[PDB]
Amino acid sequence: MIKPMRIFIGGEELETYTSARLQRTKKQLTGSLTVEIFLNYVPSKPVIVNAVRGKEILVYVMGELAFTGEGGSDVTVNFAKGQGYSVTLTARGRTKYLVDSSHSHPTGSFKDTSDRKVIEALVKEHKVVLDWQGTEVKEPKITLRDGNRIFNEIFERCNQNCHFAYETRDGKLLVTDGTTGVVGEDIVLGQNILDFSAEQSEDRANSEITVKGHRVAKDVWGKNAIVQPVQSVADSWVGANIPLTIQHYGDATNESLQRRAKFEADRRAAESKSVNVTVFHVWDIGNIHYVEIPPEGIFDVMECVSLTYSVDAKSTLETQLELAP
Amino acid sequence: MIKPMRIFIGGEELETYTSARLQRTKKQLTGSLTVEIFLNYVPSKPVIVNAVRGKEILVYVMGELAFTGEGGSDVTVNFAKGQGYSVTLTARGRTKYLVDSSHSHPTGSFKDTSDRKVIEALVKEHKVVLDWQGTEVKEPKITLRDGNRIFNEIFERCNQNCHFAYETRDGKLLVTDGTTGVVGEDIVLGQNILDFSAEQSEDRANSEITVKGHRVAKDVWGKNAIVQPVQSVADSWVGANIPLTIQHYGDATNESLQRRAKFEADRRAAESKSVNVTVFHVWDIGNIHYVEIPPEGIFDVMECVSLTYSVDAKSTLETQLELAP
Amino acid sequence: FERHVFRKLDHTDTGAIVTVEGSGTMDEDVPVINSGYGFNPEDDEELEVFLLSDGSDASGKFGVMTIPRNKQRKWPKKTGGIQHPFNADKFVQLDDDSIWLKDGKFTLG
Amino acid sequence: TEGSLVTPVPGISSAVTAYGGNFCGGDDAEECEPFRTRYLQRLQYEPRL
C-alpha cells in the first residue's frame, strides 16, 4: 500500500524502521518519538558506523507532516545472545534545548514590559521561532529566578494567565488560550472505536477556589496591597463543598486573580473526565470531535488532548486519544 | 450458604458484585473499598444509566457492619474488544472530605485552648462526628498553617502527643493513644494460617533519640527558652549505638518532648517487626491476638494494625493482616 | 517571610505584643524585636509589620515594625539619622557640617 | 457622600465623591407567599382598579 508513514533523518530515508511510535501531548512543552532499526555485523569485515548524536528527524503520516524533531537525542544499541541485535533512536521538539538549558538572560530582571516581550527574549537565545496568538498582558514587575530552566519559567508565567504552552507539528512554539477550532471526525461507537475507558473521579474537583496575593506596583501599600486583593471563583458543577485556597506567585491584580482561578478550574474539570480511545488504522490535537457511547451516555463535544501513532512488525497499527470536555 | 458479605449503596442492594475488596488501615485517616460490577448493553434499544458520582455505601460482612462510605466517589467504566464490558466503583470513609478539603478556619490562629477544642472547630465545618477517648492537652499557642489540608494539621498536631488518628467502621473519627482492648482469636500455625512472612530490619531502629525545640509560652525567653528544653529517650532493645536527633515543631514542653519521643519509638519498633498472615475464610483492627510460629519462635501477644477482605468470582476468599507489637 | 498590617500594640514584661492582621494572625503575637529603635503607634494607623518565622515553625513569628510610608523623610545626600515615627520634620541628623536637631521645642533633664 | 477607589490608577485622584443624592434601589427577591397574594389580587374583583 501507499506508505501511510514515512520518516526522514537529515534527508536520507529510513527503510528499515522495524517499529515506530509517535506522541504529541498538549499538557507538556515538547513531543517525542522512538524508532527501532535493524543493524548487522559481519565478523572480520568492515562496518560503516553513523552514530549520529544530533541531526534533524522528520515523520510524515499518510503524506502529511506529523512531527519536527532536533533528532538523535538518544542512541542505544541493544544486543542479545539469542533473538537479535538492533538499535534504538529518540527525538524531541525543536525547543528541546529550552527544556534542558538554564536561562542566560542579559540582566535577569525586567523593569516594565509584557509577557510576550519577555518570552521573546528568553526563547530567542536558541533560535526557536515563536507562534503567539493569545492576548498580551502588562506586568509591572518580572524577575526570572537566577539559573531557573526555560521550561519552568515559561510554564510558571503562562499558568497565571491561562496560556497553554505546547508545540505544533512544524517546529514552533504555540501559546493559545483555547482550541484551534479544527473540526475533526465523529467518533461513533460501533463504527470505528476499538476500546475505551471513561472515568469521573471526585478526588480532583473543588466547588470553591480562593486566591491570595500582594501587590507590587510602583506605589501601592497598606490595606490596598495586603488585605484588599482577594477573589473567589466557583465551578458550580460539583454539588458538594470541597473548599480550596491558593497563593499567587506574582503581582496580584483583581483580573489576574480570576485568570489563575479559571486556569485551575479548566485543569481540574478536564482531569475529572479523562477518556481513552483506540481507533485502529492511522488530524491534530486540540481538535473538536463528536462522540457517541450510549452505554454510558456520551453525547457531548470533546477536545482531544493527546495523540499517539504506534506501529509494529506484525502489522498492528493503532492510534490513541485522551479526549476531555 | 448465608451470604458472608452484603453490599449496600443508597439503600438498593448490589446483586452483581462480581468482585470486592475492603481495606482498613490504622496508619492513615480513611479506609477504602472497591467493587467490580457487570454492566450490559444491547444496540438500538433503550438503556438506563445511574452513574451516581456520590451516595452512601455500606458493607456488611457475615451479618455485621464492616465499612461506611461517602460512597461512589469514583466511577470508571472499562471496556474491551474481547473479554467483556464492566464497571468499577470506589469509596472511602465519611472523612474523605477532610483528606481533600483545605481548611476554612474562621480566623486562622487560636489564642489559648486545648487540642480537643481545636479538632472540634476544624472538622465540624463538614458535619463529621468526632469520637474522642484520649487525654486532653492544653497549650498556649496553636496557629494552623494557611491553606494546609485537614489531614495534614490533625496528623501533625497528633504526632507530638502520641495520639493515633484513624477511622472506625461506623463513620466516626477515633483519636486514641492505645489499643481498643478487644481480644481476638489465637492464630495458631497449622490451624488457620495459609501464609506468613515475618521480618526484622535494623535499618529502621535507633537506640537513642534526642528532641530539641525553643519555647513560646506567654513570657519566657533567654536560657529557659532556648538551651533548656532538651530531652532524650532511649529504647534499650537494640544493642548498638545508632543515635538520632529530632526537631520539635511547636511550643516545647518537657512533657511534650518525651511524648513526641515515645511516639517515634513506637513507630520505629512496630516497623521493625512487621508480620503478614492469610487466614482463608472471612473482628476489628487494633485487637489483641496470640500467634504461634515455632520455626521463628513467635510466642508473644500480637495486635493487628491493618485488615483486608478480598473476594473473586473464581471463589478465592481470603483475608490479610499486618501485625506489629 | 510574610507581610501583614498593624492594628494594636500592647506592652508586657518582656517586650511588646502586637496584633498585625493577615487574618487573625494572633491576638497576642510573640514579642517584637527592638534593636534600639521602638515606638508605640496609635490604634489602627497606616503602617506595615513584617513577620519572620522561627525556622519554619508557624508557632513563632517575630515582627519588624516599620515607619508609616506616608511619613518617611527624604533625607539629603550624604546624611542620615533618626526621625519622629509620625512626622518627617522632627528628626535628628548627623552630618559633615554639624549635629543638627529640628523641633519647635527642646527639653532636657 | 464620600468614598475612595479600591484599585488605584496613576493620574486619578485618590478620593472620589457621589452626587448630592446617594445609592439606592436595591432589593431582595420575592418569596412564594407574597407572590401568591399578588397574583390572587389580580384575579379577584375590586372596584376602581
DSSP code per residue over B62-77: SSSEEEE--EEEEEEE
Are B292 and B188 a contacting pair, CB within 8 Å?
yes
Question: What resolution does the deposited structure have, in angstroms?
Answer: 3.4
**End-to-end C-alpha distance for chain C, whole angstroms:** 42
Angstroms from A166 CA to nearest CA on chain B: 29
Of A132, A131, A123, the residue nearest A150 (C-alpha): A123
Contacts of A309 (CB under 8 A, 6+ apart): A5, A20, A21, A22, A61, A66, A282, A319
C22 phi, psi to nearest 5 deg: 80, 55
| Chain centroid, CA B95 distance in Å | 12
DSSP 8-state class, residue B145: P
Mutate to test the interface with B, among A192, A202, A318 (most CBs of B within 10 A): A202
**End-to-end C-alpha distance for chain A, whole angstroms:** 36
**End-to-end C-alpha distance for chain D, whole angstroms:** 41
Of C17, C92, C15, the residue nearest C49 (C-alpha): C17
Integer Cα distance of A304 and A25 in angstroms: 10
Contacts of C73 (CB under 8 A, 6+ apart): C83, C88, C89, C91
Burial class (CB in 10 A: 0-12, 13-18, 19+), A103: buried
Are A213 and A252 a contacting pair, CB within 8 Å?
yes
**Helix %, strand %, coil % for chain D, to 5?**
25, 10, 65
User: Is A300's Cβ below 8 Å from some Cβ in B?
Assistant: no
Rounded to 10°, the helix A150-159/A115-123 angle is 170
Burial class (CB in 10 A: 0-12, 13-18, 19+), A68: buried
**What SS3 state is found at C42?**
coil
User: Is A249's Cβ below 8 Å from some Cβ in C?
Assistant: no
Of B86, B98, B107, B94, the residue nearest B55 (C-alpha): B94
Rounded to 10°, the helix B115-123/B150-159 angle is 170
> B259's torsion region: left (phi>0), alpha (psi -120 to 50) or beta?
alpha
User: Is D7's Cβ below 8 Å from some Cβ in A?
Assistant: yes
Integer Cα distance of A323 and A303 in angstroms: 6
Long-range interactions of B144-148: CB distance < 8 A, separation 24+:
B144/B103, B144/B105, B144/B108, B144/B109, B144/B110, B144/B118, B144/C58, B145/C58, B146/A245, B146/A247, B146/B108, B146/C23, B147/A245, B147/A246, B147/A247, B147/B102, B147/B103, B148/B102, B148/B103
Angstroms from A224 CA to nearest CA on chain D: 7
Are C42 and C73 a contacting pair, CB within 8 Å?
no
CB contact under 8 A, D8 and A254: no
Of B172, B182, B196, B194, the residue nearest B303 (C-alpha): B182
User: Is A246's Cβ below 8 Å from some Cβ in D?
Assistant: no
β-pair partners for A61: A5
Residues of chain B neighbouring C56 (CB-CB closer than 8 A)? 249
Of A118, A134, A132, A136, the residue nearest A168 (C-alpha): A132
User: Is B223's Cβ below 8 Å from some Cβ in C?
Assistant: no
Q: Count CB-CB contacts under 10 A for residue A108.
A: 12
Are C14 and B99 a contacting pair, CB within 8 Å?
no
* Residue in this structure with the C-alpha cell 503581582, named with its chain if needed: A251
Residues of chain A neighbouring C69 (CB-CB closer than 8 A)? 221-222
Torsion of CA A85, A91, A97, A98, to 10 degrees: -140
Q: Method used for this model?
A: cryo-EM
Q: What is the 3-state secondary structure (H, E, C) of A90-144?
A: EECCCCHHHHCCECCCCCCCECCEEHHHHHHHHHCCCCCCEEECCCCCEECCECC
User: Is B280's Cβ below 8 Å from some Cβ in C?
Assistant: no
Q: Count CB-CB contacts under 10 A for residue C49.
A: 23
CB contact under 8 A, C13 and B143: no
Integer Cα distance of A223 and C47 in angstroms: 9
For chains B and C, tell me whether 3 or more CB atom pairs sit within 8 A of each other.
yes
> C15's torsion region: left (phi>0), alpha (psi -120 to 50) or beta?
left
**What SS3 state is found at B302?**
strand
Contacts of D33 (CB under 8 A, 6+ apart): none
Q: Count CB-CB contacts under 10 A for residue C80.
A: 10
Are A320 and A38 a contacting pair, CB within 8 Å?
no
DSSP 8-state class, residue B219: T
User: Is C88's Cβ below 8 Å from some Cβ in A?
Assistant: no
The CA distances from residue B216 to B35, B222, B250, B253, C10, in Å, are 50, 11, 8, 9, 18
Residues in chain C that come right before a backbone break, where C and next N are over 2.5 Å apart: none
B244 phi, psi to nearest 5 deg: -140, 150
User: Is A195's Cβ below 8 Å from some Cβ in B?
Assistant: yes
| Chain centroid, CA A325 distance in Å | 17
β-pair partners for B276: B197, B322
Residues of chain D neighbouring A254 (CB-CB closer than 8 A)? 7
DSSP 8-state class, residue B123: H
Residues of chain A neighbouring B53 (CB-CB closer than 8 A)? 200, 202
* DSSP for A200-249, written as a single string: EEGGG--SEEEEE----STT--GGGTTTS-EEEEE--SS-S---EEEE--
Enumerate helices (H) and strands (E) in chain B, giving the number of each.
4, 22
Neighbours of chain D (3+ CB pairs under 8 A): A
Integer Cα distance of B208 and B242 in angstroms: 7
User: Is C11's Cβ below 8 Å from some Cβ in B?
Assistant: no
CB contact under 8 A, A222 and C22: no
User: Is B74's Cβ below 8 Å from some Cβ in A?
Assistant: yes
Long-range interactions of C74-82: CB distance < 8 A, separation 24+:
C82/C37
- Report the amino acid identity of residue B123: V
β-pair partners for A234: A208
Pull the grid cell for residue B153: 494539621
Length of chain D: 49
C59, closest residue in chain B (CA to CA):
B250
Are B71 and B9 a contacting pair, CB within 8 Å?
yes
Integer Cα distance of B56 and B67 in angstroms: 11
**What SS3 state is found at B8?**
strand
C70 phi, psi to nearest 5 deg: -70, -15
User: Is B250's Cβ below 8 Å from some Cβ in C?
Assistant: yes
Pull the grid cell for residue A166: 505546547
CB contact under 8 A, B221 and C31: yes
Integer Cα distance of C41 and B127 in angstroms: 43
CB contact under 8 A, C46 and A222: yes
Task: State the number of CA atoms in the 13 A half-sphere of B184 facing the CB.
Answer: 22
Pull the grid cell for residue A5: 508513514
User: Is C58's Cβ below 8 Å from some Cβ in B?
Assistant: yes
Residues of chain C neighbouring B260 (CB-CB closer than 8 A)? none
User: Is D1's Cβ below 8 Å from some Cβ in A?
Assistant: no
**What SS3 state is found at A256?**
helix
Catalogue the E-assigned strands of B129-261: 130-132, 138-139, 164-167, 173-176, 183-188, 195-197, 208-212, 230-234, 244-247
Exposure pattern of B168-191 as b/e (b: 16+ CB <10 Å)? bbebbbbbbeeeeeeebeebeeee
Facing residue for B251 by CB, picked from C25, C31, C59 = C59
CB contact under 8 A, A295 and B47: yes
Contacts of C13 (CB under 8 A, 6+ apart): B219
Sheet holding A57-61, edge to edge: A12-13, A5-9, A57-61, A65-68
Are B277 and B321 a contacting pair, CB within 8 Å?
yes
Residues in chain B that come right before a backbone break, where C and next N are over 2.5 Å apart: 69, 282
The CA distances from residue B69 to B6, B124, C2, in Å, are 14, 18, 40
User: Is B68's Cβ below 8 Å from some Cβ in A?
Assistant: no
Contacts of C77 (CB under 8 A, 6+ apart): none
Pull the grid cell for residue C45: 494607623
Integer Cα distance of C105 and A78 in angstroms: 91
Integer Cα distance of C96 and C84 in angstroms: 22
Integer Cα distance of B178 and B233 in angstroms: 19
Residues of chain B neighbouring A194 (CB-CB closer than 8 A)? 81
Mutate to test the interface with B, among C57, C61, C62 (most CBs of B within 10 A): C57
β-pair partners for B277: B196, B321
A190 phi, psi to nearest 5 deg: 85, -5
Q: Strand A130-132 to strand A173-176: parallel, antiparallel, or no bridges (unpaired)? A: parallel
Of B200, B201, B270, B199, the residue nearest B235 (C-alpha): B270
Integer Cα distance of B6 and B58 in angstroms: 8
Angstroms from B244 CA to nearest CA on chain C: 20
Integer Cα distance of C8 and D2 in angstroms: 26
β-pair partners for A88: A36, A76
Of A74, A29, A34, the residue nearest A308 (C-alpha): A34
User: Is C60's Cβ below 8 Å from some Cβ in B?
Assistant: yes
Enumerate helices (H) and strands (E) in chain C, giving the number of each.
0, 8
- Report the amino acid identity of residue A294: P
**What SS3 state is found at D21?**
coil
Neighbours of chain C (3+ CB pairs under 8 A): A, B
B269 phi, psi to nearest 5 deg: -60, -45
Pull the grid cell for residue B275: 508480620
Integer Cα distance of A66 and B264 in angstroms: 56
Integer Cα distance of A21 and A25 in angstroms: 13
Contacts of C33 (CB under 8 A, 6+ apart): C62, C63, C64
- What is the interface size between A and C, counted as CB pairs within 8 Å? 17
CB contact under 8 A, A217 and D8: yes
Neighbours of chain A (3+ CB pairs under 8 A): B, C, D
| Chain centroid, CA B180 distance in Å | 14
Integer Cα distance of C23 and C4 in angstroms: 9
Residues of chain B neighbouring A214 (CB-CB closer than 8 A)? none
Q: What is the largest CA-CA distance in chain B?
A: 83
Residues of chain A neighbouring B49 (CB-CB closer than 8 A)? 295-297
CB contact under 8 A, B108 and C23: yes
β-pair partners for A311: A20
Contacts of B103 (CB under 8 A, 6+ apart): B122, B125, B144, B147, B148, B149, B150, B153
Integer Cα distance of B237 and B267 in angstroms: 14
Of B65, B94, B57, the residue nearest B5 (C-alpha): B65
Q: Count CB-CB contacts under 10 A for residue C71.
A: 15
Angstroms from A204 CA to nearest CA on chain B: 8
